Design an enzyme around this catalytic site. Structure first.
Site, PDB file in Angstrom:
ATOM      1  N   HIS A 184     -89.406  49.094  44.358  1.00 25.81           N
ATOM      2  CA  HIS A 184     -89.840  50.024  45.193  1.00 25.81           C
ATOM      3  C   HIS A 184     -89.383  51.584  44.763  1.00 25.81           C
ATOM      4  O   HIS A 184     -90.104  52.543  45.246  1.00 25.81           O
ATOM      5  CB  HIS A 184     -89.021  49.919  46.610  1.00 25.81           C
ATOM      6  CG  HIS A 184     -89.641  50.723  47.670  1.00 25.81           C
ATOM      7  ND1 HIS A 184     -88.986  51.962  48.034  1.00 25.81           N
ATOM      8  CD2 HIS A 184     -90.617  50.555  48.529  1.00 25.81           C
ATOM      9  CE1 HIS A 184     -89.414  52.472  49.022  1.00 25.81           C
ATOM     10  NE2 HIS A 184     -90.515  51.771  49.298  1.00 25.81           N
ATOM     11  N   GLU A 244     -92.035  52.910  42.452  1.00 27.55           N
ATOM     12  CA  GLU A 244     -93.092  53.355  43.178  1.00 27.55           C
ATOM     13  C   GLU A 244     -92.791  54.963  43.624  1.00 27.55           C
ATOM     14  O   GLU A 244     -93.912  55.805  43.710  1.00 27.55           O
ATOM     15  CB  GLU A 244     -93.600  52.645  44.680  1.00 27.55           C
ATOM     16  CG  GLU A 244     -94.790  52.857  45.381  1.00 27.55           C
ATOM     17  CD  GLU A 244     -94.531  52.384  46.593  1.00 27.55           C
ATOM     18  OE1 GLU A 244     -93.994  51.050  46.920  1.00 27.55           O
ATOM     19  OE2 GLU A 244     -95.073  52.972  47.552  1.00 27.55           O
ATOM     20  N   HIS A 245     -91.669  55.356  43.984  1.00 26.77           N
ATOM     21  CA  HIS A 245     -91.459  56.767  44.169  1.00 26.77           C
ATOM     22  C   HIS A 245     -91.678  57.605  42.932  1.00 26.77           C
ATOM     23  O   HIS A 245     -92.331  58.886  43.203  1.00 26.77           O
ATOM     24  CB  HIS A 245     -90.056  56.933  44.907  1.00 26.77           C
ATOM     25  CG  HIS A 245     -90.038  56.633  46.266  1.00 26.77           C
ATOM     26  ND1 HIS A 245     -89.601  57.362  47.088  1.00 26.77           N
ATOM     27  CD2 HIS A 245     -90.184  55.492  46.787  1.00 26.77           C
ATOM     28  CE1 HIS A 245     -89.632  56.725  48.437  1.00 26.77           C
ATOM     29  NE2 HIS A 245     -89.869  55.228  48.157  1.00 26.77           N
ATOM     30  N   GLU A 251     -84.746  61.348  44.381  1.00 27.17           N
ATOM     31  CA  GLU A 251     -85.419  60.241  45.201  1.00 27.17           C
ATOM     32  C   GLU A 251     -84.319  59.340  45.860  1.00 27.17           C
ATOM     33  O   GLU A 251     -84.340  58.687  46.824  1.00 27.17           O
ATOM     34  CB  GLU A 251     -86.338  59.330  44.364  1.00 27.17           C
ATOM     35  CG  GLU A 251     -87.595  59.781  44.039  1.00 27.17           C
ATOM     36  CD  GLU A 251     -88.491  60.704  45.209  1.00 27.17           C
ATOM     37  OE1 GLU A 251     -88.874  59.910  46.252  1.00 27.17           O
ATOM     38  OE2 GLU A 251     -88.286  61.704  45.277  1.00 27.17           O
ATOM     39  N   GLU A 293     -84.531  56.365  53.958  1.00 30.86           N
ATOM     40  CA  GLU A 293     -85.330  55.391  54.493  1.00 30.86           C
ATOM     41  C   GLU A 293     -84.740  54.098  54.822  1.00 30.86           C
ATOM     42  O   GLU A 293     -85.538  53.392  55.903  1.00 30.86           O
ATOM     43  CB  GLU A 293     -86.509  54.877  53.115  1.00 30.86           C
ATOM     44  CG  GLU A 293     -87.634  55.723  53.047  1.00 30.86           C
ATOM     45  CD  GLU A 293     -88.400  55.395  51.832  1.00 30.86           C
ATOM     46  OE1 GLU A 293     -87.948  55.175  50.683  1.00 30.86           O
ATOM     47  OE2 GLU A 293     -89.672  55.008  51.947  1.00 30.86           O
TER      48      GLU A 293
END
Ligand SMILES: CCCCCCCCCCCCCCCCCC(=O)OC[C@H](COP(=O)([O-])OCC(O)COP(=O)([O-])OC[C@@H](COC(=O)CCCCCCCCCCCCCCCCC)OC(=O)CCCCCCCCCCCCCCCCC)OC(=O)CCCCCCCCCCCCCCCCC
Ligand SMILES: CCCCCCCCCCCCCCCCCC(=O)OC[C@H](COP(=O)([O-])OCC[N+](C)(C)C)OC(=O)CCCCCCCCCCCCCCCCC
Ligand SMILES: CCCCCCCCCCCCCCCCCC(=O)OC[C@H](COP(=O)([O-])OCC[N+](C)(C)C)OC(=O)CCCCCCCCCCCCCCCCC
Ligand SMILES: CCCCCCCCCCCCCCCCCCCC(=O)O[C@H](COC(=O)CCCCCCCCCCCCCC)COP(=O)(O)OCCN
Ligand code: HEM
Ligand code: HEM
Ligand SMILES: CCCCCCCCCCCCCC(=O)OC[C@H](COP(=O)([O-])O)OC(=O)CCCCCCCCCCCCC
Ligand SMILES: CCCCCCCCCCCCO[C@@H]1O[C@H](CO)[C@@H](O[C@H]2O[C@H](CO)[C@@H](O)[C@H](O)[C@H]2O)[C@H](O)[C@H]1O
Ligand SMILES: CCCCCCCCCCCCO[C@@H]1O[C@H](CO)[C@@H](O[C@H]2O[C@H](CO)[C@@H](O)[C@H](O)[C@H]2O)[C@H](O)[C@H]1O
Lengths: 61, 124, 54, 383, 75, 438
Positions: free
Chosen positions: F49, F52-53, F122, F129
C-alpha cells in the site's frame, strides 16, 4: 494494546484441526453420550417411579 | 373469511339475474333484522379489525372517515352500555350505509394475495 | 468420518433417533451387565445360589 | 410515579384487577369469569377443609364423610357447600362458554385464551369426576367403574391401562386413595391454567357484546367492574344459600348415601348432571371405542370454532340467522343432557343419535354454511 | 425477442407448496422413527410390550423371555 | 453478444488482453498484478500500500510535478488500488491518448524513484490514514472480519499494515517488494473501450519488454488458510447504526462450487430501505426484514481468494432492540439453504444472476476490471456462453449439498460494530446455524 486489528493471542487455545468433520463430530459425541445417558436415566426413572401405581404386592396377593 | 372472498361471491350473485332476484330482497330484510343500523353503525364498522390486513386498511382511511368511524364506535358503545337504541339522526339510514372501508381492505388484501401467489412462482 | 457425521449427526432428527436407539441398546445391555456383575460379587449369598437345595 | 405502577409485584396485580382497561359496555354475561373465580375459591377453601376431616382409605371414606356431616362443627355446611358449588361451578362454566361462543370470543385475536379454556374445561371435568368418587357411595363406586372401563376401549393396551388407573383389578382402596391425592391436586393445576388463559387474554383485552374494538372507549376494571361483579356475587350467594341451606340434596343422587357395594349394582348408573350431555353422546355411538372417541371429540371440537366460523363479523349480536342456529344448538345441548339420564329405551335411542348428529353438524356444517351466507347478506344487504 | 416472463404459480396452502414439503418428507420419516424408538423404549417395561412386540424380534427377542421359577414366585 | 476478448503474450510472459468497443470514445488501459498485501510477511506488512503512494511520487525521468502535468495533459486520469491479492494501476483516457497512458504506467511501475525524502513525507500521510478509515464503517467491519476469520495468517493482515511498520518501511524493502512481486508473469496489461489489440501489444513491446521474469513462472491465479470461527465486538454506544458482518469460510475463484455459492448468495440477496423497489423483493429475508423494520440494509457477499473465501452477509440496523431478531431471522434463512430450497428459489436466483453477471459490466472501467480480475484469478476470460452454462448446471440439489457442507452447523466469523448490546454472545449466534427441527 492499541491496534484493534491485531487479534489477541489465542494460540494457547486454538485447535489446529478446527474445521475438520472429526473435530465437530467429537464434541457431538460427548453431547450425544450425555443425551443418551439422560434418555436411559429418564426412562429408568419414569418406569421405576410410575410403577408405584401398578398393583402393590398386597393387592396382587 | 377474507373480504375479497365475500366481495367476489357477492358479485357472482349480483351478476346472475335469477340469483339477484331472490337474494337481493332476502339480504335487504336480513340487514333490517340485523339491527346494526339501530346503533348508528354502518355495516363496515362491524368488520373484525384485529388482523394485520385490517389494521393496514384502517390506517389508509382518509382522516375525515377515520374520525367519523371513531365517533360511531364510541356512540354505539354508549348505546350498548345504556341499553338504549339510536333515535332520530343517530339511526343509520340506508343511504348513509356506505362501504367506506371495503375499497381499502380490498387493496390491502389484493397485494397480500398477490404476494402469496408470487412467493410460489416457478420459472418455466 | 465426514460420512459418519453426515449420516448420524447433521440432521437433528437423525441425531435424536441415534441417541434414543443408543439409549435402548445401552439400557438393555447395562441391565444384563450389572446383573452378571452383581451375581459375581455376591456369589453364594443370594437366594438363587441356595435355591438348588430345595 | 404511583406505587401500584412502580413496584413490579403490585404492578402485576394492578394490571389485572385495577388499572386493567376494559370495554365500557360489558353486559352481565361478562360476570361469569369472576363467578367462576369465586367458585374456585370456595372449592379450594371448602375442599381443603374437608380434606382435614376426610379419610381416603376405602374402609373409612364413606364413614368419614358421615363424620363430617354429623360430628364436625359446621361440617354439614362445608360438605354441602363443596358439593353444591361443584354444581354451580358447572352452571357458571357452561354460561361462560356459552357467552364466549355467542359473542365470538373464540375468534382471532383470542384463539389462545379460548384454546387454553378448552383445557380448563377438561380439567374441571376430571377434577369433578374424581371428587365424586371420594364419597365412596354406590354412585361413587359404580360411576368410577363404568367411566374407567371406557379406557378399556383403547386398542391393545386398554385393559392394562385400566388396571394401572385402578391400582388393582377393580375399583377399590388403591383407586380411592389415588383419586384423593389427584382430586386435591387437580384444582391447583386448574387454577394455573385459569391464570394462563387470562394472561393470554390480556394481549387483546376482553371482547365486548358489540364485537367491535373497545380501544376507542375503555374503563378501569376498578371501580366499575368491581362493583358490577358484586351484584352477581350476591345473586350467586342467594342461589347458593337456597341450595345449601334449604335444599342441600336437590342436585344429588340418593344412591350416593348408600355405602359402595361391589356386589349390588344400582338401578341406573348415571354421571353427575353436568356430565350428562357427554354421556348421551357416548351412548349414541354403538361401538365402544367409537363412543369414547365421540365423547372426547364433543369437547375437543370446540377447538375448531376459530376455523369453522367464517364470519367477517365477530359474534352474534347482529346476526339473526346465527342467533337462531345458536339457540337450537344450546337447546339441543340441553336435550342431550336430558337424554343422558333416561333409560336406554325407545324412543330415546334414536332421538339421542339425532341430537348427537345435530351437535356435531353445528360445528362441521351449519356454522361454516351460515357464517358464509351471512357474510354475503351483509355485503349485498348494505349496497 | 421475449415479450413476457415465463412462470406459473404452483399450488400452495398456508405458505406450503409441494416442492418445499417434498424436501421435508424424509425428515418426518426420521422423526417418526425417533418417535417410534422413543415410545417403544418408554413402554419396554410394560409386560404386554414384551409379550407382543419385543420377544418376537429375531435373535434379540430372547432378552425379554424371562420366567420366574415357580419355586420363587409367591403369586 | 459482446466482442471477443483478444489475448496475447510477450516473450517475458506478460499477458495482454483487450476488449474493443467501437461504440465508445474513451479507453481504459491498465496493469492488473497478481500480487497484493498477502505477499508481504509480518515485518513488511503495509509495503504494497505504501508503494501505491510512492508510485505517483515521481520517476527517474519525470519529477512529481512533471508526472502530474503529463497526466493533466493527457486529459484522463490515473487510478490505483491495492487489495489483499491484487494490485491494479489503470489509466482512463481518450481513444488516441492511449500511447501516452501506457507509457506513463510503464514508467511509474518500473522506474519509480522511491526517494528517501518522499518515503519520509508519505510516512505521515499514511499514518494519518490509520485514523480516518475509522469513519468508513463497512471497511472497518470487513477489515476486522478478515482479521478474525484468518487469525494470524496472511489473509488476516490489513492492507495499511501496523503503525510500527509504517515508521520502519525503507526504500530498500519497497524496492525488494516490487522486484520480487511485480514480475511479467504476474502482470496483465488490459485494454477496454477504444483500443486496438495489435496497437496495445506493440505498446507493450515498447514499454514492458524489459520486465523481470520470476524464476518459477506458475500460471496466473495460483496461490494454507485455516478459518477461525470467532467474533469481534467493537461496541460503540455513541454510534446510531449497528454494522454486523457474519461469514463462513466460502469458496475460492477456482472452486467447483463457485457458481453454486453465487446462486446461494442470490437466494438471500440484498436489501436497502432507501431503494423504492426493495420492499417488493422475492427474497424471504428481504420480506421479513422489511415488514418488521429490522434493518436499514443487508448485503450478501461471496468474496473469493485464490485458495479460500468468505461467504456471508453484512447488515446495518438502527433497530437496536431487535438486532437479536434480525440475526435470528438471517441465520434461519441460511438454514433453509440446507433444508428447504427447491427449484422455486434456485431457478429464480439463476435468472437473476444470468443477467446480473453481465449487467455489472456497464463502463470501460468495469469491463477492464472484469478482464483484469478474470485473467489474474483464473488465467483466462470466461466467455458469457460458458458463464451461462456453468450457472445452468447449478441445480437445487447442488445448492442444498453445498449449503449442508458450508453453512449448516458451521463456525461463523462475526463482527459487530456500534450499538450491539442486543447482539447475543457467540454461542447463541452460532446455535442458529442449525435447526433442531431438522
Ligand atoms: C347462576 C348464578 C347466579 C348469578 C346470576 C347471573 C346472571 C346474569 C346474566 O348474565 O344474565 C342477566 C341478563 C341481563 O344482562 P344485561 O347486561 O342487562 O343484558 C345482557 C343482554 O345481552 C341484553 O339483552 P337484550 O338487551 O337484548 O335483552 C334481552 C332480555 C332482556 O333483558 C333483561 O334483563 C330484561 O330478554 C330476553 O332475552 C328474554 C327472552 C324472552 C322470554 C319470554 O339477562 C338477560 O338478558 C338474559 C337473556 C338470556 C336469554
Ligand atoms: C430429561 C430427559 C432428557 C432427554 C434427552 C434425550 C435425547 C435428546 C438429546 O440428547 O438432545 C440432543 C439434541 C441435539 O443437540 P444440539 O441441539 O446441541 O445438536 C444440534 C446440532 N446437530 C443437529 C448438528 C447435532 O437436542 C435437542 O434436540 C434438544 C432436546 C433436549 C431436551
Ligand atoms: C335458551 C336459548 C338461548 C338463545 C339466545 C339467543 C339470543 C337472546 O335472545 O339472548 C339475549 C341476549 C341478546 O344480547 P345481544 O348482545 O345479542 O343484544 C343486545 C341488544 N342489541 C342487539 C340491541 C345490541 O343474548 C345474550 O346475552 C346471550 C348469551 C348466551 C349464554 C348461553 C348459555 C348456554 C350454555 C351452553 C354451553 C355449551
Ligand atoms: C363478598 C365480598 C364483598 C364485600 C366487600 C365489598 C366492599 C365493601 C364496602 C366498601 C366500599 O364500598 O368501598 C370501596 C371498597 O371496594 C373495593 O375496593 C372493592 C370493590 C368491590 C369489591 C370486590 C370486587 C369484586 C370484583 C371481582 C369479583 C371476584 C370474585 C372472585 C373471588 C372503596 O371505593 P372505591 O375504591 O370505588 O373509591 C371510593 C373512595 N375511596
Ligand atoms: C376456572 C374456570 C375459568 C375461570 C375462573 C375463568 C375466568 C375468566 C375471566 C375472569 C375472564 C375475563 C372476564 C370475563 O370475560 O368473564 C375470562 C375470559 C375468558 N375465558 Fe374464562 N375462565 C374459566 C374457564 C374458561 C373456559 C372453560 C373457557 C373456554 C372454554 C374460557 C374461555 C375464556 C375466554 C375465551 C375469555 C375471553 C372472553 C372475552 O372477554 O371476550 N374460560 N375467563
Ligand atoms: C374445582 C375444584 C373442585 C371441584 C369441582 C370439586 C368437586 C368435588 C365434588 C363434586 C365432590 C363430590 C362431593 C359430594 O357429593 O360429596 C368433591 C368431594 C371432595 N373434594 Fe372436591 N372439588 C374441588 C376442589 C377440591 C379441593 C381443592 C380439595 C382439597 C382437598 C377437595 C377435596 C374434596 C374432598 C376431601 C372431598 C370428599 C368429601 C366430600 O364428598 O365432600 N376438593 N369435590
Ligand atoms: C420426537 C420429536 C418430534 C419433533 C418433530 C419436528 C417436525 C418439524 C418439521 C418441520 O418443521 O417442517 C417444515 C416443513 C416446511 O418448511 P418451511 O416453510 O419451514 O421451510 O413443514 C411441512 O412440510 C408441513
Ligand atoms: C409415556 C410414558 C410411557 C408409560 C410409562 C410406563 C409405566 C410402567 C412401565 C413398567 C413398570 C413395570 O414394569 C416393570 O418395571 C420393573 C422396574 O420398575 C421391572 O422389574 C425388574 O427390576 C426391578 C428393580 O429394578 C425388580 O424389582 C424386578 O424383580 C425386575 O423384574 C420389570 O421387569 C418391568 O416389567
Ligand atoms: C387476576 C388475579 C390477580 C393477580 C394478577 C395475575 C398475576 C400474574 C400476572 C403477571 C403476568 C404478566 O402480566 C403482564 O404484566 C405486565 C405488568 O404487570 C403488564 O404490562 C402492562 O402494564 C404496565 C403498567 O401497568 C405497562 O408497563 C405495560 O405497557 C402494559 O402492557 C401486561 O399487560 C401483563 O400481561
Amino acid at each position: 494494546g492499541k491496534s484493534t486489528y491485531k487479534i489477541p493471542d489465542f494460540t494457547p487455545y486454538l485447535k489446529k484441526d478446527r474445521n475438520t468433520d472429526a473435530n465437530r463430530l467429537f464434541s457431538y459425541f460427548m453431547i450425544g453420550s450425555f443425551g443418551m445417558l439422560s434418555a436411559a436415566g429418564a426412562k429408568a426413572t419414569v418406569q421405576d417411579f410410575l410403577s408405584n401405581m401398578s398393583a402393590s404386592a398386597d393387592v396382587l396377593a | 373469511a377474507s373480504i375479497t372472498s365475500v366481495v367476489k361471491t357477492s358479485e357472482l350473485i349480483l351478476k346472475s339475474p335469477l340469483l339477484s332476484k331472490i337474494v337481493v330482497p332476502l339480504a335487504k330484510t336480513y340487514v333490517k333484522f340485523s339491527g346494526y343500523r339501530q346503533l348508528g353503525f354502518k355495516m363496515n364498522d362491524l368488520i373484525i379489525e384485529e388482523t394485520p390486513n385490517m389494521q393496514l386498511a384502517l390506517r389508509r382511511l382518509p382522516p375525515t372517515e377515520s374520525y367519523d368511524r371513531v365517533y360511531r364506535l364510541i356512540r354505539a358503545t354508549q348505546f350498548s352500555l345504556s341499553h338504549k337504541l339510536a333515535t332520530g339522526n343517530d339511526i343509520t339510514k340506508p343511504e348513509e350505509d356506505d362501504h367506506y372501508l371495503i375499497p381499502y381492505i380490498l387493496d390491502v388484501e389484493a397485494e397480500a394475495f398477490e404476494k402469496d401467489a408470487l412467493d410460489n412462482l416457478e420459472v418455466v | 468420518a465426514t460420512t459418519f457425521y453426515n449420516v448420524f449427526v447433521k440432521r437433528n432428527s437423525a441425531f435424536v433417533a441415534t441417541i434414543l436407539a443408543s439409549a435402548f441398546v445401552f439400557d438393555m445391555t447395562f441391565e444384563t451387565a450389572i446383573d452378571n456383575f452383581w451375581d459375581r460379587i455376591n456369589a453364594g449369598k443370594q437366594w438363587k445360589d441356595i435355591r438348588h437345595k430345595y | 410515579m404511583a406505587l401500584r405502577k412502580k413496584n413490579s409485584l403490585l404492578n402485576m396485580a394492578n394490571s389485572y384487577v385495577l388499572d386493567s382497561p376494559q370495554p365500557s359496555n360489558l353486559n352481565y354475561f361478562w360476570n361469569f369469569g369472576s363467578l367462576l373465580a369465586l367458585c374456585l375459591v370456595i372449592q379450594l377453601a371448602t375442599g381443603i377443609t374437608l380434606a382435614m376431616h376426610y379419610t381416603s382409605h376405602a374402609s373409612l371414606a364413606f364413614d368419614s364423610v358421615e363424620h363430617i356431616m354429623r360430628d364436625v362443627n359446621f361440617g354439614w355446611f362445608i360438605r354441602y357447600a363443596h358439593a353444591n358449588t361443584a354444581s354451580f361451578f358447572f352452571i357458571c362454566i357452561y354460561a361462560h362458554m356459552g357467552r364466549n361462543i355467542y359473542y365470538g370470543s373464540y375468534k382471532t385475536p383470542r384463539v389462545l385464551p379460548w384454546s387454553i379454556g378448552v383445557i380448563i374445561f377438561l380439567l374441571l371435568i376430571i377434577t369433578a369426576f374424581m371428587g365424586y368418587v371420594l364419597v365412596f357411595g354406590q354412585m361413587s363406586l359404580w360411576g368410577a367403574t363404568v367411566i374407567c372401563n371406557l379406557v378399556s376401549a383403547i386398542p391393545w393396551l386398554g385393559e392394562d391401562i385400566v388396571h394401572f388407573l385402578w391400582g388393582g383389578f377393580s375399583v377399590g382402596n388403591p383407586t380411592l386413595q389415588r383419586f384423593f391425592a389427584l382430586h386435591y391436586l387437580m384444582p391447583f393445576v386448574l387454577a394455573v391454567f385459569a391464570l394462563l388463559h387470562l394472561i393470554a387474554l390480556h394481549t387483546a383485552g376482553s371482547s365486548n357484546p358489540l364485537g367491535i374494538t373497545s380501544n376507542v372507549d375503555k374503563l378501569s376494571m376498578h371501580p366499575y367492574y368491581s362493583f358490577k361483579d358484586l351484584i352477581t356475587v350476591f345473586a350467586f350467594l342467594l342461589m347458593f344459600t337456597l341450595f345449601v341451606f334449604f335444599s342441600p340434596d336437590k342436585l344429588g343422587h340418593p344412591d350416593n348415601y348408600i355405602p359402595a357395594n361391589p356386589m349390588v349394582t344400582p338401578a341406573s348408573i348415571v354421571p353427575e348432571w353436568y356430565l350428562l350431555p357427554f354421556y348421551a353422546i357416548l351412548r349414541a355411538i354403538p361401538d365402544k371405542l367409537g363412543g369414547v372417541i365421540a365423547m372426547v371429540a364433543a369437547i375437543l371440537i370446540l377447538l375448531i370454532l376459530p376455523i369453522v366460523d367464517r364470519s367477517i363479523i365477530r359474534g352474534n349480536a347482529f346476526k339473526p340467522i346465527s342467533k337462531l342456529l345458536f339457540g337450537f344448538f344450546i337447546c339441543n345441548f340441553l336435550l342431550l343432557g336430558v337424554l343422558g339420564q333416561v333409560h336406554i329405551e325407545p324412543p330415546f335411542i334414536v332421538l339421542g343419535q339425532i341430537c348427537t348428529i345435530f351437535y356435531f353438524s353445528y360445528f362441521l356444517i351449519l356454522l361454516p354454511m351460515v357464517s358464509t351466507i351471512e357474510n354475503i347478506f351483509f355485503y349485498i344487504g348494505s349496497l | 425477442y421475449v415479450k413476457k416472463p415465463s412462470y406459473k404459480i404452483v399450488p400452495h396452502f398456508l405458505g406450503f407448496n409441494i416442492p418445499t414439503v417434498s424436501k421435508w418428507i424424509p425428515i418426518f420419516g426420521i422423526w417418526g422413527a425417533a418417535a417410534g424408538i422413543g415410545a417403544l423404549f418408554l413402554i419396554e417395561g410394560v409386560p404386554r410390550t414384551r409379550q407382543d412386540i419385543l420377544s418376537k424380534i429375531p435373535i434379540i427377542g430372547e432378552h425379554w423371555i424371562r420366567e420366574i421359577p415357580a419355586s420363587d414366585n409367591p403369586f | 453478444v459482446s466482442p471477443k476478448t483478444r489475448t496475447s503474450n510477450l516473450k517475458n510472459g506478460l499477458t495482454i488482453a483487450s476488449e474493443s468497443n467501437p461504440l465508445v470514445q474513451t479507453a481504459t488501459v491498465g496493469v492488473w498484478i497478481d500480487a497484493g498485501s498477502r505477499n508481504e510477511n509480518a515485518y513488511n506488512n503495509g509495503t504494497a500500500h505504501f508503494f501505491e503512494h510512492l508510485a505517483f511520487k515521481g520517476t527517474d525521468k519525470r519529477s512529481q510535478h512533471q508526472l502530474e502535468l503529463d497526466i493533466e495533459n493527457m486529459g484522463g486520469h490515473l487510478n490505483a488500488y491495492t487489495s489483499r491479492e491484487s494490485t491494479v494501476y489503470y489509466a482512463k483516457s481518450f481513444k488516441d491518448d492511449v500511447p501516452k497512458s501506457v507509457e506513463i504506467l510503464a514508467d511509474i511501475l518500473q522506474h519509480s524513484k522511491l526517494a528517501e525524502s518522499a518515503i519520509d513525507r508519505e510516512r505521515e500521510v499514511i499514518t494519518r490514514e490509520l485514523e480516518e478509515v475509522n469513519k468508513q464503517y463497512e471497511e472497518v467491519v470487513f477489515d476486522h472480519l478478515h482479521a478474525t476469520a484468518f487469525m494470524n495468517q496472511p489473509l488476516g493482515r490489513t492492507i495499511l499494515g501496523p503503525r510500527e511498520n509504517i515508521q520502519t518501511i525503507t526504500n530498500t524493502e519497497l524496492r525488494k517488494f516490487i522486484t520480487e512481486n511485480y514480475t511479467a508473469d504476474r502482470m496483465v496489461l488490459v485494454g477496454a473501450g477504444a483500443v486496438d489489440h495489435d496497437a496495445l501489444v506493440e505498446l507493450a513491446e515498447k514499454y514492458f519488454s524489459h520486465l523481470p521474469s520470476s524464476q518459477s513462472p506458475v500460471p496466473l491465479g495460483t496461490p494454507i488458510p485455516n478459518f477461525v470461527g470467532s467474533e469481534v465486538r467493537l461496541r460503540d454506544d455513541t454510534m446510531p447504526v449497528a454494522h454486523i458482518a457474519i461469514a463462513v469460510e466460502g469458496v475460492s475463484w477456482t472452486s467447483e462450487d463457485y457458481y453454486t455459492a453465487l446462486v446461494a448468495q442470490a437466494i438471500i440477496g440484498n436489501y436497502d430501505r432507501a431503494v423504492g423497489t426493495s420492499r417488493h423483493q422475492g427474497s424471504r429475508l428481504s420480506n421479513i426484514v422489511s415488514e418488521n423494520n429490522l434493518a436499514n440494509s443487508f448485503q450478501s457477499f461471496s468474496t473469493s481468494y485464490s485458495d479460500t473465501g468468505l461467504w456471508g452477509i453484512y447488515l446495518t440496523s438502527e433497530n437496536t432492540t431487535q438486532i437479536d431478531d434480525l440475526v435470528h431471522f438471517t441465520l434461519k434463512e441460511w438454514n433453509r439453504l440446507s433444508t428447504s430450497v427447491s427449484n422455486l428459489q434456485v431457478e429464480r436466483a439463476k435468472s437473476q444472476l444470468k443477467a446480473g453477471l453481465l449487467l455489472s459490466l456497464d463502463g470501460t472501467t468495469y469491463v477492464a476490471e472484469d478482464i483484469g480480475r478474470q485473467l489474474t484469478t483464473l488465467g483466462r476470460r470466461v466467455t458469457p456462453a460458458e458463464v451461462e452454462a456453468k450457472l445452468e448446471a447449478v441445480t437445487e440439489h447442488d445448492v442444498r449439498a453445498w449449503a449442508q457442507k458450508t453453512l449448516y452447523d458451521k463456525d461463523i466469523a462475526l463482527v459487530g460494530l456500534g450499538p450491539i448490546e442486543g447482539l447475543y454472545d457467540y454461542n447463541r449466534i452460532r446455535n442458529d446455524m442449525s435447526m433442531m427441527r431438522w
